[PDB]
Amino acid sequence: GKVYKKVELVGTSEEGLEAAIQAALARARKTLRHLDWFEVKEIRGTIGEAGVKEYQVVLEVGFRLEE
Amino acid sequence: GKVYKKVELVGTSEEGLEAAIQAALARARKTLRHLDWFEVKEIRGTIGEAGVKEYQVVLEVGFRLEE
Amino acid sequence: GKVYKKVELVGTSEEGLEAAIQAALARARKTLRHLDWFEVKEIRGTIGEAGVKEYQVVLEVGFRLEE
Amino acid sequence: GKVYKKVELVGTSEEGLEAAIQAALARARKTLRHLDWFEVKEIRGTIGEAGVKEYQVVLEVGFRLEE
Amino acid sequence: GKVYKKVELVGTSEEGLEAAIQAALARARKTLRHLDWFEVKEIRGTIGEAGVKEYQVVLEVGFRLEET
Amino acid sequence: GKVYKKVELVGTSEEGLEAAIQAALARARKTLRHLDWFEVKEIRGTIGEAGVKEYQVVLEVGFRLEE
Amino acid sequence: GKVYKKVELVGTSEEGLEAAIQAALARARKTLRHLDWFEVKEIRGTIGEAGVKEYQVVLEVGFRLEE
Amino acid sequence: GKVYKKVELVGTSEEGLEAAIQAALARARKTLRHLDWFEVKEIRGTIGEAGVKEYQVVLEVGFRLEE
Amino acid sequence: GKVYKKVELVGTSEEGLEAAIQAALARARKTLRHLDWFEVKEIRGTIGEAGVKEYQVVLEVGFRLEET
Amino acid sequence: GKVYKKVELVGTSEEGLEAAIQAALARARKTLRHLDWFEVKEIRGTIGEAGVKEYQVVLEVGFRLEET
Amino acid sequence: GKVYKKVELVGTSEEGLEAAIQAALARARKTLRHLDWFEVKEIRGTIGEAGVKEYQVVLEVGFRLEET
Amino acid sequence: GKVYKKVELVGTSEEGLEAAIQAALARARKTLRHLDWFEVKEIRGTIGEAGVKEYQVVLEVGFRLEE
Ligand SMILES: [Cl-]
Ligand SMILES: [Cl-]
Ligand SMILES: [Cl-]
Ligand SMILES: [Cl-]
Numbered sequence: 001g002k003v004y005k006k007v008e009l010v011g012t013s014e015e016g017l018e019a020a021i022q023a024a025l026a027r028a029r030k031t032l033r034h035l036d037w038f039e040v041k042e043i044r045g046t047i048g049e050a051g052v053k054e055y056q057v058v059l060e061v062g063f064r065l066e067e
Numbered sequence: 068g069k070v071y072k073k074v075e076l077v078g079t080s081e082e083g084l085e086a087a088i089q090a091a092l093a094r095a096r097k098t099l100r101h102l103d104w105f106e107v108k109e110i111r112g113t114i115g116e117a118g119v120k121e122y123q124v125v126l127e128v129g130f131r132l133e134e
Numbered sequence: 135g136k137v138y139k140k141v142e143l144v145g146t147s148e149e150g151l152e153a154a155i156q157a158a159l160a161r162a163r164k165t166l167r168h169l170d171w172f173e174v175k176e177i178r179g180t181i182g183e184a185g186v187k188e189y190q191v192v193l194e195v196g197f198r199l200e201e
Numbered sequence: 202g203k204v205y206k207k208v209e210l211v212g213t214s215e216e217g218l219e220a221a222i223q224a225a226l227a228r229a230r231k232t233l234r235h236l237d238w239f240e241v242k243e244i245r246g247t248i249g250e251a252g253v254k255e256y257q258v259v260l261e262v263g264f265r266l267e268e
Numbered sequence: 269g270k271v272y273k274k275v276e277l278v279g280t281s282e283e284g285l286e287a288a289i290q291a292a293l294a295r296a297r298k299t300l301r302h303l304d305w306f307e308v309k310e311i312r313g314t315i316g317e318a319g320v321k322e323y324q325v326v327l328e329v330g331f332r333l334e335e336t
Numbered sequence: 337g338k339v340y341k342k343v344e345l346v347g348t349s350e351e352g353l354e355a356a357i358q359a360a361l362a363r364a365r366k367t368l369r370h371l372d373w374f375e376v377k378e379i380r381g382t383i384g385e386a387g388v389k390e391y392q393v394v395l396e397v398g399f400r401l402e403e
Numbered sequence: 404g405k406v407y408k409k410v411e412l413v414g415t416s417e418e419g420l421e422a423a424i425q426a427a428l429a430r431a432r433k434t435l436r437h438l439d440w441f442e443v444k445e446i447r448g449t450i451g452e453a454g455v456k457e458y459q460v461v462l463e464v465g466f467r468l469e470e
Numbered sequence: 471g472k473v474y475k476k477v478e479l480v481g482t483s484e485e486g487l488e489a490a491i492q493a494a495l496a497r498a499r500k501t502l503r504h505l506d507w508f509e510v511k512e513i514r515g516t517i518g519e520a521g522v523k524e525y526q527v528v529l530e531v532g533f534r535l536e537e
Numbered sequence: 538g539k540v541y542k543k544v545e546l547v548g549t550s551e552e553g554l555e556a557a558i559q560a561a562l563a564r565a566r567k568t569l570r571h572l573d574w575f576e577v578k579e580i581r582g583t584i585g586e587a588g589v590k591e592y593q594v595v596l597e598v599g600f601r602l603e604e605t
Numbered sequence: 606g607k608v609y610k611k612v613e614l615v616g617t618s619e620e621g622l623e624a625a626i627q628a629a630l631a632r633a634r635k636t637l638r639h640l641d642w643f644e645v646k647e648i649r650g651t652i653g654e655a656g657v658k659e660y661q662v663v664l665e666v667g668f669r670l671e672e673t
Numbered sequence: 674g675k676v677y678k679k680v681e682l683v684g685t686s687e688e689g690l691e692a693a694i695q696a697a698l699a700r701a702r703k704t705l706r707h708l709d710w711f712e713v714k715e716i717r718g719t720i721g722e723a724g725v726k727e728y729q730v731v732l733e734v735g736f737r738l739e740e741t
Numbered sequence: 742g743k744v745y746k747k748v749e750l751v752g753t754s755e756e757g758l759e760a761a762i763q764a765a766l767a768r769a770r771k772t773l774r775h776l777d778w779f780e781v782k783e784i785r786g787t788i789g790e791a792g793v794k795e796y797q798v799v800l801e802v803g804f805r806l807e808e
């Protein structure tokens with residue numbers, strides 16, 4: 001029947017976790033069609049003087065393949 | 068001595084991670100007694116036109132069993 | 135060449151996930167030099183009357199070592 | 202929002218994998234309401250003189266919690 | 269054919285691992301029928317002045333589900 | 337020497353496991369060249385009134401890249 | 404008391420998953436005594452013109468040892 | 471230089487964990503030479519009327535190979 | 538709020554698992570303050586003529602850190 | 606902010622691990638822009654009469670995605 | 674159809690990873706027929722005054738079984 | 742009896758895998774006594790114009806503690 005594909009992206013953001021997820025999804029929407037779900041694989045980040053510099057959320061994004 | 072039980076729930080929310088966790092704890096409180104701790108096992112979600120539609124946090128809820 | 139070391143900490147907070155992470159980092163800054171990055175290993179917490187009492191994020195902090 | 206629960210079952214069958222999955226789902230339908238999805242965790246079995254005696258499929262079954 | 273169910277329990281004991289395990293099974297027997305096997309998932313515990321205060325063994329208990 | 341690439345697909349089918357795998361390979365053949373092997377990563381599915389509604393097999397498909 | 408041993412085999416077949424498993428078991432019966440149970444570790448395969456050429460199921464076979 | 475080999479065994483015993491391990495080692499000593507180390511992979515068991523019927527410890531035994 | 542640190546130790550013992558664990562905790566209380574819990578990560582060991590020579594239990598010890 | 610992408614490649618080489626890795630990156634450079642890091646997932650290979658025929662290193666290559 | 678068996682070996686070497694691997698395969702071809710592939714499971718080693726004393730690579734060797 | 746401790750380090754090097762490991766050991770020898778064994782946990786690295794910029798090997802170093 002239907003077939004899906006999953007790509008692995010790493011969304012980053014200095015705001016927070018949800019923000020990094022959205023950044024990844026925002027860029028994904030630009031070149032992928034029929035985005036359906038995502039799965040967080042990892043949550044890491046860089047440290048700066050104020051603490052968390054950038055939050056990086058590794059995630060898989062699943063989308064339906066046309067035909 | 069004491070014995071605990073763990074149930075796996077999946078809390079969802081359109082607002083965020085914490086929210087989805089709280090939603091699962093909220094509903095757990097209604098039928099489970101002596102809730103002690105939780106563990107997040109997965110963080111996934113659905114995608115909509117605006118990006119994240121629903122955040123789904125799969126977690127285990129540990130509670131003490133009565134004798 | 136360079137060499138890094140990783141330490142495992144557990145930041146806690148009643149505010150949220152990001153907060154618990156910053157708390158760990160904050161305290162790490164006090165005794166460790168050259169903090170570079172962090173990795174989230176686990177996300178767990180305690181349950182109170184109002185739901186989540188305290189969020190506990192187990193994370194590894196990596197930092198550069200002096201030759 | 203909505204909250205789901207997952208229970209772990211082990212469906213068995215001498216016919217095959219799909220059969221063992223269905224056996225588990227058949228019994229689940231008897232006492233659980235709003236079954237939505239399943240996830241295969243393990244696939245094992247017992248050996249007899251003709252080879253596979255019983256196929257055992259360990260799976261999690263997710264269902265929506267009412268209210 | 270047959271269909272089993274697995275619940276996750278955490279047995280505790282100040283004595284030792286084997287005790288923690290039995291503690292969890294003892295309580296399991298009280299409300300579950302047809303217990304068949306168990307699998308240890310984690311072994312952890314609390315620390316006191318004398319060392320290990322309590323041993324906590326997280327395990328899964330498998331049991332046979334009946335007809336209806 | 338030679339280099340291969342792996343894509344993650346999710347083949348679905350209402351008939352069975354093999355079927356869902358074939359569905360993913362079928363669609364992969366249409367846009368990928370030199371398909372060599374596959375690996376099943378997860379087996380999950382939806383539930384309907386009759387039990388299993390759709391079998392979903394997540395798998396990785398390996399293929400040789402051209403120079 | 405009793406003691407078991409586990410060996411890792413890889414059954415193959417062009418028919419299907421169950422077939423590949425029986426093939427491994429069949430051949431195990433020829434040199435091993437007291438086969439008790441098996442565990443599926445991986446499911447993979449090769450790709451041909453018609454889709455799946457050969458299904459390969461990596462499994463562990465456990466059997467009782469003679470004192 | 472030296473080359474070792476590892477075999478996976480499952481020691482059983484109604485006494486306890488240490489017992490089950492010893493049982494496996496005892497039987498291993500009978501057909502394997504130069505036993506050096508072991509690694510516990512799993513700990514499970516059966517359940518009887520008095521609780522633990524038998525303790526089963528899955529472990530790998532490593533020994534040096536001759537040449 | 539509070540912050541904890543975890544260190545990985547390997548307690549050995551010729552007696553048994555619980556012993557190996559206690560060994561590690563004993564040594565741990567000598568240089569670490571506020572020990573709270575432990576998590577067993579691996580269980581391995583050396584083989585001797587009598588079977589198990591020494592039981593080695595890899596565990597993580599978690600303790601609270603002082604702001605100072 | 607920035608968003609990266611990861612593709613999984615399998616570099617092969619009769620020379621050694623390091624070579625297999627470079628082989629995969631070399632080919633990666635041909636069609637991917639802004640390569641930043643790689644992570645080794647598996648190390649396997651084929652066996653010949655002389656021993657290792659080919660080393661195969663499965664790895665993930667991370668790269669920065671552009672604006673549009 | 675065909676059936677393969679996998680054995681776990683640990684190849685050691687003071688030279689390097691690839692060497693350790695070759696060591697294991699060399700010994701393997703002495704008592705096993707039809708070796709086809711290997712999979713590295715772990716990489717560990719012993720420490721000496723000069724750093725790495727011996728590299729130990731745990732790997733699984735897969736070979737085809739003969740019906741007979 | 743004896744008690745060991747393990748620290749996680751990340752050796753780096755532009756030369757190779759063995760180099761990166763040695764680097765970490767070298768630096769470990771400077772502040773840790775009785776180094777016995779190491780375990781490789783991860784192998785990653787950065788990418789430059791010539792391919793591998795630097796090899797990074799995450800490993801745990803175990804040493805005996807005194808008393
Ligand atoms: Cl792609
Ligand atoms: Cl339940
Ligand atoms: Cl430390
Ligand atoms: Cl063997």
Ligand SMILES: [Cs+]
Pocket residue numbers: 284285286486487488553554555
């Ligand atoms: Cs004991």
Ligand SMILES: [Cs+]
Pocket residue numbers: 621622623689690691757758759
């Ligand atoms: Cs090398």
Ligand code: NA
Pocket residue numbers: 016017018083084085150151152
């Ligand atoms: Na958050």
Ligand code: NA
Pocket residue numbers: 217218219352353354419420421
């Ligand atoms: Na099937």
